[PDB]
Design a protein around this ligand. Structure first.
Ligand SMILES: *[C@@H]1O[C@H](CO)[C@@H](O[C@@H]2O[C@H](CO)[C@@H](O[C@@H]3O[C@H](CO[C@H]4O[C@H](CO)[C@@H](O)[C@H](O)[C@@H]4O)[C@@H](O)[C@H](O[C@H]4O[C@H](CO)[C@@H](O)[C@H](O)[C@@H]4O)[C@@H]3O)[C@H](O)[C@H]2NC(C)=O)[C@H](O)[C@H]1NC(C)=O
Ligand SMILES: *[C@@H]1O[C@H](CO)[C@@H](O[C@@H]2O[C@H](CO)[C@@H](O[C@@H]3O[C@H](CO[C@H]4O[C@H](CO)[C@@H](O)[C@H](O)[C@@H]4O)[C@@H](O)[C@H](O)[C@@H]3O)[C@H](O)[C@H]2NC(C)=O)[C@H](O)[C@H]1NC(C)=O
Ligand SMILES: *[C@@H]1O[C@H](CO)[C@@H](O[C@@H]2O[C@H](CO)[C@@H](O[C@@H]3O[C@H](CO)[C@@H](O)[C@H](O)[C@@H]3O)[C@H](O)[C@H]2NC(C)=O)[C@H](O)[C@H]1NC(C)=O
Ligand SMILES: Nc1nc(=O)c2nc(CNc3ccc(C(=O)N[C@@H](CCC(=O)O)C(=O)O)cc3)cnc2[nH]1
Ligand SMILES: *[C@@H]1O[C@H](CO)[C@@H](O[C@@H]2O[C@H](CO)[C@@H](O)[C@H](O)[C@H]2NC(C)=O)[C@H](O)[C@H]1NC(C)=O
Ligand SMILES: *[C@@H]1O[C@H](CO)[C@@H](O[C@@H]2O[C@H](CO)[C@@H](O)[C@H](O)[C@H]2NC(C)=O)[C@H](O)[C@H]1NC(C)=O
Ligand SMILES: *[C@@H]1O[C@H](CO)[C@@H](O[C@@H]2O[C@H](CO)[C@@H](O)[C@H](O)[C@H]2NC(C)=O)[C@H](O)[C@H]1NC(C)=O
Ligand SMILES: *[C@@H]1O[C@H](CO)[C@@H](O[C@@H]2O[C@H](CO)[C@@H](O)[C@H](O)[C@H]2NC(C)=O)[C@H](O)[C@H]1NC(C)=O
Ligand SMILES: CCCCC/C=C/C/C=C/CCCCCCCC(=O)O
Ligand SMILES: CCCCC/C=C/C/C=C/CCCCCCCC(=O)O
Ligand SMILES: *[C@@H]1O[C@H](CO)[C@@H](O)[C@H](O)[C@H]1NC(C)=O
Ligand SMILES: *[C@@H]1O[C@H](CO)[C@@H](O)[C@H](O)[C@H]1NC(C)=O
Ligand SMILES: *[C@@H]1O[C@H](CO)[C@@H](O)[C@H](O)[C@H]1NC(C)=O
Ligand SMILES: *[C@@H]1O[C@H](CO)[C@@H](O)[C@H](O)[C@H]1NC(C)=O
Lengths: 49, 289, 357, 49
């Protein structure tokens, strides 16, 4: 049934927004790590900043 | 609001092969690999007079103050005035036929002089390097981090400049010149992170163990067998392989830890409570939820 | 150098090389790689995962690979007398190492099977471990012009102690000139042997050096860089073994490390061998069992490793229970794209056919 | 001059423009110890001097 499928799609759009929000914190954007703690541990100024 | 520190008692890394005897020529470089050990960095640095360093994705001070899964050192006798021939993208014979630095892991290149009285390292008669290596010309170039295919042929020794050796298929040529003054060396250092259940640590970074029993459910800094971070710990039913000691999720974030006390702890990043403010402009008063 | 023990003296035992009795249509027992059981999969280093599915890039066998079969045999025997050894021609075959390999050991133990030496006799099958030589350059054995000689430093891996120990050493192999030895005119193959009447008589007096003593008759060991040994619990369970090499040395893996009733292989040693390994050869074994006590030995199977992407499923306890080889077919690619073993019915676009120059 | 290394400015811009203030620290120092003054150095110069 199309209507029930639409219900599930509304729920899934809500869930996907949050999941995409959380996943972006694992993007390095070309840095050596996506974790600030690792960056502070491995490098020194000015390369750190 | 606290610290959680657990470390195993380990032996000391063995640097004696590097500190005794004669360092080899560059094409026959020696490699050392260390795991699950501690070493005295301050002592090692005081044996040498560094003339230059260049690092990639790591810094020497971080190597002095943190731990890593493994530590690899390649070393050889090398004249400091040939420094530019070891740079990345160099076009000369050093990179083609003797040593090519790999950049797949964090790495640092160090040149140094051995003081005359300080150490037990002995001088070779000559510095030496290969000028060509070819199959009969079909040149054979070094892979990054690898040895020249001509290594066996070159072990016959070189007595004069531009002396050649052949075995019928391979041919190589060598260049030699005398050592003058203090001996000079090169070191190529690389490390790895998170590939072992134990670590390699400089002695200056070691600290006394502490317990987590009175620090549950609050944000603490932790150092567990060399793996460091911030997080909140909670006692949990055991999951995963205890002998692997660390449990991770699909994003390669730490989510669990098997302690040597026998318990398993769930690990979470430090959290913050939401705050909302209710403000009425007319009365200029506020409340919080 | 390290001490390799007492130098050998005397003569080598003759071997009869007869491949037509080993690689035969009656002795073909194919076993392929079954990814649904995650056969031949090395476990990742330094971590574990619980109750999840994920993709992982590493060194893995190809799905449904048949690999290569090897079988060992008893030597010739008559009531009261022990005679020549009986082997295939594995000692003269040289294989490319490439990215390494994995080995399935003792899969047919507990089944009745042939005693290769006698095409009619049947026995219950027993597990037997392989032995290897690995090196950087190869040549001919000098007198006979028979292939398979390893020059310069050679890595040797050699089981011993009736299955309770394995040696691992890196030394130059210097041939001896005595009868049937590697430098003689009567040499046919490098065949190591043990005598179970005097070596494996009692579980409290297993001879831990018999295979090493036999190897030393073929060669004098010179300028060895290292000598290690690892203790093994004796049983009849099927096992997996693996070997790779990278910048940090040669790595060895085994399913015995954590739980021998699961088939995941775990790292257990690193060897300081830094020059690239290019060649390996199986060292044939031949058991000098007495005529009254004759046995059949389980075949073993070697599968090559490749750099591939795999989909891995972890259970709650942390073991890998099943896997998908992403590059096997289009469905496997769809499953790897969704990071799931369960996909919905549909029509999906997947990675295009690869175009390389 | 035997070497210079600058951060977010260049010597020619210092020669041709103005600034709110100028601070100079100076000392006797052997040029062959130059690497011990680099950022991220692990030696005694950065730690104690
Ligand atoms: C499993 O693997 C280990 C490690 O390789 C083997 O252990 C070695 O075994 C050999 C014997 O085969 C030992 O060798 C003997 O060492 C005696 C003392 O050595 C001292 O110095 C060495 C070198 O620094 C140290 O490693 C050692 O701890 C001691 O401090 C020597 O006195 C012996 O010499 C005499 O016997 C030999 C016999 O061949 C004669 O040739 C000599 O002339 C002399 O008469 C001998 O060298 C060696 O020390 C062991 N190493 C360790 C670390 O324990 C195991 O044997 C092996 N187990 C197996 C295969 O079952
Ligand atoms: C890493 O390696 C370092 C270098 O080996 C280690 O440092 C050395 O550690 C030893 C042991 O603590 C020190 O030795 C002692 O030094 C004191 C002080 O000496 C000075 O004063 C006395 C008079 O009081 C004088 O006689 C000396 O000449 C000195 O002027 C002595 O009193 C002791 O008897 C003993 O010699 C070394 O001094 C010290 N070296 C340096 C350069 O600091 C370090 O401990 C290692 N780290 C680890 C964790 O192992
Ligand atoms: C050949 O036969 C022997 C004997 O039957 C096999 O060994 C036995 O195999 C069983 C089944 O895997 C093992 O059972 C398991 O034992 C563990 C012990 O902790 C238990 O936790 C499991 O639930 C299960 O009961 C048994 O222990 C094992 N015996 C020995 C001595 O290891 C052997 O596996 C057979 N080989 C082949 C190739 O089939
Ligand atoms: N000497 C001998 N060695 C063997 O390994 C052997 N194997 C078989 C058959 N082996 C097997 C092993 C596994 C499966 C299987 O599918 N499980 C089937 C047959 C028969 N005779 C033998 N005989
Ligand atoms: C080892 O033995 C096998 C079996 O005899 C050899 O393979 C055979 O070689 C002959 C001669 O070229 C071929 O005609 C057969 O077809 C081969 N048999 C199979 C099953 O492929 C093999 O060449 C030998 N290896 C050596 C001598 O190194
Ligand atoms: C090792 O021995 C093999 C034979 O086992 C040699 O191959 C022979 O090469 C000669 C000379 O080119 C040919 O005439 C023969 O026909 C070859 N024999 C076979 C059976 O193929 C080989 O040259 C030797 N290798 C080395 C490195 O000396
Ligand atoms: C590696 O092994 C080869 C083969 O045994 C050695 O080769 C001989 O070396 C001597 C001395 O240089 C030469 O006179 C011979 O002509 C070589 N034979 C061949 C077939 O090349 C070689 O020396 C060994 N290399 C090392 C580093 O020991
Ligand atoms: C095994 O190692 C020994 C010790 O290094 C080697 O003997 C040396 O050989 C060189 C080259 O012939 C000589 O210049 C030295 O004088 C020898 N030293 C000693 C202490 O004897 C020997 O060559 C090596 N054996 C091999 C490679 O087969
Ligand atoms: C001293 C060389 C002078 C050459 C003058 C003109 C050359 C024509 C083109 C040359 C290519 C540039 C090579 C630069 C060498 C850098 C040193 C090194 O890569 O190690
Ligand atoms: C000359 C040092 C040779 C040390 C060889 C191997 C060391 C093991 C690990 C060392 C950490 C790297 C220190 C690099 C020093 C750079 C100079 C500086 O920071 O000022
Ligand atoms: C750390 O432990 C050792 C051994 O018990 C002790 O000697 C030392 O004083 C401790 N250090 C601190 C700072 O408590
Ligand atoms: C943590 O949980 C385990 C298992 O539930 C329990 O046995 C253990 O005592 C707990 N630890 C503490 C300190 O209470
Ligand atoms: C494991 O994962 C499955 C699938 O999401 C879930 O239903 C199940 O509850 C999990 N099991 C445990 C023991 O956490
Ligand atoms: C091995 O080959 C050589 C030629 O290289 C030949 O003189 C010798 O007789 C051969 N040996 C045998 C046993 O065939």
């Amino acid at each position: 049934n199309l209507a029930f499928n639409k219900v599930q799609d509304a729920v899934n759009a809500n869930a996907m927004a949050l999941s995409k929000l959380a996943a972006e914190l694992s993007n390095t954007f070309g840095a050596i790590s996506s974790s600030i703690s690792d960056i502070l541990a491995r490098l020194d100024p000015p390369e750190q900043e | 609001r606290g610290e959680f520190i657990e470390q195993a008692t380990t032996q000391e890394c063995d640097f004696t092969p590097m500190l005794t005897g004669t360092p080899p020529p560059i094409y026959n470089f020696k490699r050392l690999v260390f795991t699950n050990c501690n070493y005295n960095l301050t002592k090692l640095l005081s044996l040498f007079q560094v003339s230059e360093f260049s690092c990639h994705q790591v810094s020497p001070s971080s190597l002095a103050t943190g731990c890593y899964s493994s530590l690899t050192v390649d070393y050889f006798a090398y004249s400091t005035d040939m420094s530019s021939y070891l740079q990345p993208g160099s076009a000369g014979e050093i990179v083609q036929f003797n040593y090519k630095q790999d950049f797949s892991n964090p790495t640092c290149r160090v040149l140094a002089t051995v003081p005359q009285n300080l150490t037990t390292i002995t001088k070779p008669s000559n510095y030496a390097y290969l000028t060509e290596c070819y199959k009969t010309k079909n040149y054979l170039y070094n892979a990054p981090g690898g040895y020249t295919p001509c290594l066996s042929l070159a072990s016959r020794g070189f007595s004069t400049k531009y002396q050649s050796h052949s075995d019928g298929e391979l041919t190589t040529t060598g260049y030699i010149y005398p050592v003058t003054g203090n001996l000079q060396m090169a070191f190529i250092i690389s490390v790895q992170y998170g590939t072992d259940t134990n670590s390699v640590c400089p002695m200056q970074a070691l600290r006394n163990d502490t317990s987590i029993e009175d620090k549950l459910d609050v944000c603490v800094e932790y150092s567990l067998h060399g793996i460091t971070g911030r997080g909140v710990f909670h006692n949990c039913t055991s999951v995963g392989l205890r002998n692997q000691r660390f449990v991770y999720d699909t994003f390669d974030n730490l989510v669990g830890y098997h302690s040597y006390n026998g318990n398993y702890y769930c690990v979470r990043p430090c959290v913050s409570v939401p705050v909302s403010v209710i403000y009425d402009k007319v009365s200029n008063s506020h409340a919080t939820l | 150098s390290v001490d390799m023990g007492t130098t050998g003296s005397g003569n080598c035992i003759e071997s009869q090389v007869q491949p037509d009795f080993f690689e035969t249509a009656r002795n073909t027992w194919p076993l392929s790689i079954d990814t649904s059981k995650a056969e031949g999969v090395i476990y990742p280093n330094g971590k574990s995962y619980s109750n999840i599915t994920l993709t992982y890039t590493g060194l893995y066998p190809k799905a449904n690979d048949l690999g290569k079969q090897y079988v060992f045999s008893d030597g010739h025997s008559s009531p009261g007398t022990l005679s020549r050894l009986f082997v295939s021609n594995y000692s003269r075959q040289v294989e490319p190492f490439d990215s390494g390999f994995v080995v399935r050991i003792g899969a047919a133990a507990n089944k009745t099977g042939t005693t290769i030496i006698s095409q009619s006799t049947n026995r219950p099958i027993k597990k037997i471990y392989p032995a290897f030589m690995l090196g950087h350059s190869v040549g001919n054995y000098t007198p006979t012009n028979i292939t398979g000689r390893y020059l310069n430093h050679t890595l040797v891996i050699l089981p011993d102690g009736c299955g309770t120990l394995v040696h691992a050493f890196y030394c130059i192999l210097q041939p001896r000139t005595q009868a049937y030895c590697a430098g003689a005119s009567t040499f046919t193959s490098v065949t190591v042997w043990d005598t179970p009447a005097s070596d494996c008589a009692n579980s409290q007096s297993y001879n831990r050096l018999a295979n090493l003593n036999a190897f030393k008759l073929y060669f004098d060991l010179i300028n060895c860089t290292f000598r290690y040994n690892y203790t093994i619990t004796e049983d009849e369970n099927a096992e997996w073994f693996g070997i790779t090499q990278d910048t940090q040395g040669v790595h060895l893996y085994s399913s015995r490390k954590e739980n021998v009733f699961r088939n995941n292989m775990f790292h257990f040693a690193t060897l300081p061998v830094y020059q690239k390994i290019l060649y390996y050869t199986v060292i044939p074994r031949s058991i000098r069992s007495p005529f009254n006590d004759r046995k059949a030995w389980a075949a073993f199977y070697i599968y090559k490793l490749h750099p591939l992407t795999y989909l891995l499923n972890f259970d709650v306890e942390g073991y890998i229970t099943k896997a998908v080889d992403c590059g096997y077919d289009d469905l496997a690619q769809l499953q790897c794209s969704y990071q799931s073993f369960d996909v919905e019915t549909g029509v999906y676009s997947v990675s295009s056919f690869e175009a390389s120059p």
